[PDB]
Every structure is written in C-alpha cells, then in structure tokens.
Design an enzyme around this catalytic site. Structure first.
Site, mmCIF file in Angstrom:
data_model
loop_
_atom_site.group_PDB
_atom_site.id
_atom_site.type_symbol
_atom_site.label_atom_id
_atom_site.label_comp_id
_atom_site.label_asym_id
_atom_site.label_seq_id
_atom_site.Cartn_x
_atom_site.Cartn_y
_atom_site.Cartn_z
ATOM 1 N N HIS A 9 1.008 -0.865 -0.190
ATOM 2 C CA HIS A 9 -0.131 0.287 0.281
ATOM 3 C C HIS A 9 1.132 1.473 -0.324
ATOM 4 O O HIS A 9 0.131 2.653 0.256
ATOM 5 C CB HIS A 9 -0.622 -0.524 1.438
ATOM 6 C CG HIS A 9 -0.552 -0.125 2.518
ATOM 7 N ND1 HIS A 9 0.213 -1.115 3.355
ATOM 8 C CD2 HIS A 9 -0.516 1.521 2.990
ATOM 9 C CE1 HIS A 9 0.469 -0.419 4.739
ATOM 10 N NE2 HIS A 9 0.012 0.866 4.509
ATOM 11 N N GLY B 168 2.801 5.422 9.618
ATOM 12 C CA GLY B 168 4.323 5.441 9.243
ATOM 13 C C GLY B 168 4.834 4.780 9.781
ATOM 14 O O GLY B 168 6.466 4.675 9.479
ATOM 15 N N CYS C 253 4.237 1.794 8.998
ATOM 16 C CA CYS C 253 4.493 -0.230 8.159
ATOM 17 C C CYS C 253 5.692 0.258 7.562
ATOM 18 O O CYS C 253 6.084 0.808 7.337
ATOM 19 C CB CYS C 253 3.575 0.698 7.322
ATOM 20 S SG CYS C 253 1.774 0.483 8.131
#
Ligand SMILES: *[C@@H](O)[C@H](C[C@@H]1CCNC1=O)NC(=O)[C@H](CC(C)C)NC(=O)OC[C@H]1C[C@@H]1C1CCC(F)(F)CC1
Ligand SMILES: *[C@@H](O)[C@H](C[C@@H]1CCNC1=O)NC(=O)[C@H](CC(C)C)NC(=O)OC[C@H]1C[C@@H]1C1CCC(F)(F)CC1
Lengths: 303, 303
Positions: B43, B144, B146
């Site tokens: 993503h 942030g 991920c």
C-alpha cells in the site's frame, strides 16, 4: 481495548558495538568500550573465594596492565588502569571506531531506561526497566551479566546511566552509575544487605491513568480532586512516592481535559480497591510506564 | 518476590542495518533491504484517497522502476519491481553490505518475536510480542510505522516473520509474513474487518505457572491432575487454546518436579478465581511468556 502500550527499548545497535569481554583470570564479565577507555565492574578483580569481603584497594594495587584481558567478539591491549568507586577505568591502545556520541548521567527513581544484557561480551537481549524508589530494578540477569549497561537516548546522544553489578535476595537487581557510585545504599559485596521499601511511583500511575483516558477508559474519573499537597501527605502513609508534576504530565492533562488532581483523587480511591473493574485490562495500579512513554507511544510526541 | 521475567527482545543492531525508507509520492513507509532486494508493504503504491478499496494489480502495472524512491539514513536505484501477495519485492542496484544470515518463516499463535519499530526508515524502538490466537499482536505502532519488521533469532540467523501493515478497531495490530500472506483472515484494506475471538494461550500460562514455582511460589499446585485430553475439551468452552506440550515445557516439569497435568488442573481452578491470592504479583493468568522465555531467563538454557 488495547492501550497501544508496550515495554519499548531503544534500538541497541549503537551500544552493541561498544561491548567487550573483560577477564582477570577469575571472573569473566562485560565492559563498555568508548574512545580509549573500557569501563567494567571492579569485582572482575576478585577471586571467587573473596566475593563476600574483598579489599578492592589491595586487589587493585596487585594488578598491572597485562593482568586485564579485554576481547571483542579482537584483543585490546590495556595500557592504563584505575578504579573509580565500584568501577574500573581501563585504558586501551585502540579507540573504539564506533564510539557513539554519549554522556554519563544518573537516572532517578521512576525513570525508564534501556538495558543491553550481555554474556562473555556478546549481547544477548534488550529490555527496559524503571528505577524503583529503593534503587533496584526488576531485571533479567544471570551469572556473567555483570558489566551489562543501561542507557537512555536523547536525539543521537546515548546517556549511559547503569552498569550491572548484582542481584539481591528478593530477585531484583542493582548496579553502578558511571561516576562509580552504586544506586541507593548498596555495596558491591556478596553479603546480605538491608533493602529499602519499594513504593508506587505516583507520577507513573498518573501517566497510566491518562493512557487509559486516551484509550476511552475513564470510569474512574470523577469531578472530585485531591490537591498535590494533600496527595503527598497521603502518599507518605501509603508507600506511594510524592508526586511532582512535569511538562510531560501537563501535556497529558491538556490532551484529555482531565486535571492531575482528579487523577490524584482517583489513585486514592483505586488504591483501596478497583471495585471489580479493570483499567487497561489490569486490576492493579500500574507504575512501569512514564509520562514520556505515554506521550511517545500513544500521542506521537517526543521531547 | 521478583520473577526475573522481563519482556526481552533480541539485540536489534543486525536488523537496523537493513532498514530503508520507501516512498511512491503518496505514502512513506519502511522497507527491509537484504542482498539486492527491498521488501515493503504494497500500500505504498496507494494514493490516500484509495486506501479503503485499492486495485493493487492496476496500481502495480501503473508503476515503473523509478516510481519507487528508496533511501537509507543513500539512494538505492530500483532496477526491478514485483508484487507477492501484500508485499512488494523491489530489486535495487546495490547489495546490502551488512545483510545478516537470514530466513523467512511464519510465526505461530503463542510464539514470541522481536519487533523493530521504524519511521521514515529510522529505527526508533524495539519490543517483543506474542502472536495472539486471532492473528493480531498487541503492539505499539503509529502512522508511518508500516514496513517495520518482526523476527526471531536462532544462533546467528535472523528468521524474519512479520512486516507491519495495519491497526484494527480494537487497537491491536497485524501484518504480513514474507511469503506475502497476511496473518489470519485479514486484508490490507482500510475497512472494517471481522475480528476473531482472542484466547488464552494455554502453553504460555503453563510456562508462567512453572516460572512461579521456580521462584518459590506454588500454593496453586495440588496433587490433582487434569489430563491433556480432558483439559483440551474444557479449553474449547472457555476461550483457551488447546494445549500441546513441547520439550521446552517438559524440561520445566523436570526441573520443578511438577507435572503438566497438575498445572492444567490449576489453570481450571485459577480461571474461576485466584481466591484473592497473587501469582508472581498478578491476580490474572499471564500468557505473554513462552516456555522458551522461562527456560532462557530463569534457567539459563537456550535450545
Ligand atoms: C555479575 O558478576 C553477577 C550478576 C548477578 C549473578 C546472578 N544474577 C545477577 O544479577 N554479580 C554477582 O554475582 C555479585 C558479585 C558481588 C561481588 C557484587 N553477587 C551477587 O549478585 O550475588 C547474588 C545474590 C543473590 C545472592 C544472595 C547474596 C547473599 C544473601 F544476601 F545472603 C542472599 C542473597
Ligand atoms: C502504516 O502505513 C499504517 C500503520 C497503522 C497506522 C496507525 N497504527 C498502525 O499500526 N497502516 C495503515 O494506516 C493501514 C493502511 C491500509 C491500506 C492497510 N490502515 C490502518 O491501519 O487503518 C487504521 C485502522 C484503525 C482504523 C479503522 C479502520 C476502519 C474501521 F474498521 F472502520 C475502524 C478502524
């Protein structure tokens, strides 16, 4: 339902590159290599028949430079040696090429720091602890862990605050600051020692109750307030630390709209019982998270 | 009085040297650089107006190599790109010179692993979690994070098991294995998703009760026994995992002289209430410590 709070340590890479092994022929433990200096506990000089009542001044005089063997997992030739309190300051021929920016500082009761646990100079685990009001920590340390170091990190600078020395009868731990003092009244001698009473860290309980509000949990919040002065008089008879507010705590009051004094009153009521309710999944007051922990991990704010 | 148990993570230095920043112009998150490959959540390709129902196949076709910006805190030129499940596999011109020995493996419910939390490719904290029976973890992750990775370490080999993807409505977290699957039934789409019931990890409770015995705490041990089969039938109606013994648990039975079945019976009685007593300072069953944790930190045994 989940607080988003974990025991969070600093990344340990910077400190791993500073760990060495120190031996004297008797004990083997860990040292901290920074610039041309290696720090390590002074009972590396002890033969195991004298850990209960060493004469460290005499053991030190009996050593020379090549009495100390320092290895990395290299060999670092010792070219100077000295004793500061309960630590040795060994001088080696080689400057650590990965010395981080660092300071030495003393940690205060209630404050959290990160520990790198090491055996034979090999880092084996990291964890975080709070300095208890009786100057112990609830660590995880076995034989050969002495010399393991605790530290905080402000920006890029590592603030070394702890060198591990010993375990107490009750399973908790203590050690030295890098000025060579032991924390609290403790001595680096393998003998029974008086232990001060531990207490709840009131500032950290307040932090935790704020963390509960920030997660939608606030049944315990009532309009009732206990002033700081009144709470601190209460504190003295209940084995709680006296509360001293900080900007970190004030920010938590701003974000939640709940005043410190409301939570001081809540601690007094919760101390006598949770009435069968839970707070963040706990039926006991929690004091191992700091206001800075709650600001960082939940609110996203360092400072 | 103190168990000697802490949440213990692996030293993180080896993994810190593998973290990079990946951006596509919309999101910025973290990637894991090993040899000539950079792994990151897919993503990163999403514009923030499409996080709820992305078409990842179409987003991927729309990308080329220079669509991906990979930076270390360097610039790593992307020379190849591909999608495996919910991860991207970027190929870069430079092999990571500090690639550790590693494998990719999937972690099972009840097992502990270490997490390196990172923002903008900068490691900021480490902690350890157990995979819950419903394939979430009780982590600490903000916007942030991920691309942050979870891993275990066997000897010198790092077994990467987790790449962080998202937070659920209840505050817990989940992510991918490096085969690209998400753990459990979860999807990397910012929408409401069914959540499976969480359960007590029975093997880890047993481990904890052994840790209590190893620390002199055993009021709960009675000669009564519940067989594994009987306990597992009970388990099914009480939101406990079914128990499966291991050599790690057997060693704990050998050291203490207390059989697994005695502790299975004790869980059944303790589940209905501690009768006002504490175990290791807790009035609730504890399932976040593994048999391997208790063997390592208390008994001094890896395996
Ligand atoms: C590192 O060298 C070592 C780390 C200890 C070992 C086990 N866990 C740890 O954290 N340090 C020591 O072994 C020190 C050395 C002294 C010269 C300071 N000694 C101890 O830690 O002794 C262990 C105490 C728990 C033992 C005992 C002490 C006597 C008593 F009070 F009567 C009962 C408690
Ligand atoms: C990393 O990019 C980021 C980490 C998240 C952010 C906050 N804490 C974390 O762990 N991941 C995301 O933001 C993902 C991106 C998707 C494309 C997978 N999305 C979320 O984590 O969304 C946050 C969920 C808690 C929000 C919400 C979801 C919709 C709902 F179900 F209706 C209610 C719960």
């Amino acid at each position: 339902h989940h607080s988003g709070l974990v025991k969070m340590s600093h990344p340990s890479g910077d400190v791993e590159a500073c760990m060495v092994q120190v031996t004297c022929g008797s004990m083997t433990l860990n040292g901290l290599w920074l610039d041309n200096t290696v720090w390590c506990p002074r009972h590396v000089m002890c033969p195991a028949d004298q850990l209960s009542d060493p004469n460290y001044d005499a053991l030190l005089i009996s050593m020379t430079n090549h009495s100390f063997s320092v290895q990395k997992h290299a060999n670092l030739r010792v070219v100077g040696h000295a004793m500061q309190g309960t630590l040795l300051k060994l001088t080696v021929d080689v400057a650590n090429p990965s010395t981080p920016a660092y300071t030495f500082t003393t940690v205060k009761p209630g404050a959290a720091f990160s520990v790198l646990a090491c055996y034979n100079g090999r880092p084996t685990g990291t964890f975080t602890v709070v300095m208890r009001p009786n100057y112990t920590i609830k660590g995880s340390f076995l034989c050969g862990s002495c010399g393991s170091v605790g530290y905080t990190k402000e920006g890029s600078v590592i603030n070394f605050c702890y060198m591990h020395q010993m375990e107490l009868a009750n399973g908790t731990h203590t050690g030295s600051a890098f000025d060579g003092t032991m924390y609290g009244a403790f001595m680096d001698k393998q003998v029974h020692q008086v232990q001060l009473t531990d207490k709840y860290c009131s500032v950290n309980v307040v932090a935790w109750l704020y963390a509960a509000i920030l997660n939608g949990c606030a049944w315990f919040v009532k309009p009732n307030r206990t002033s700081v002065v009144s709470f601190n008089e209460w504190a003295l008879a209940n084995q709680f630390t006296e509360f001293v507010g900080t900007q970190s705590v004030d920010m938590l009051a701003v974000k939640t709209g709940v005043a410190i004094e409301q939570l001081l009153y809540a601690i007094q009521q919760l101390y006598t019982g949770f009435q069968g309710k839970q707070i963040l999944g706990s039926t006991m007051l929690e004091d191992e998270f700091t206001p800075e922990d709650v600001n960082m991990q939940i609110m996203g704010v360092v400072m």
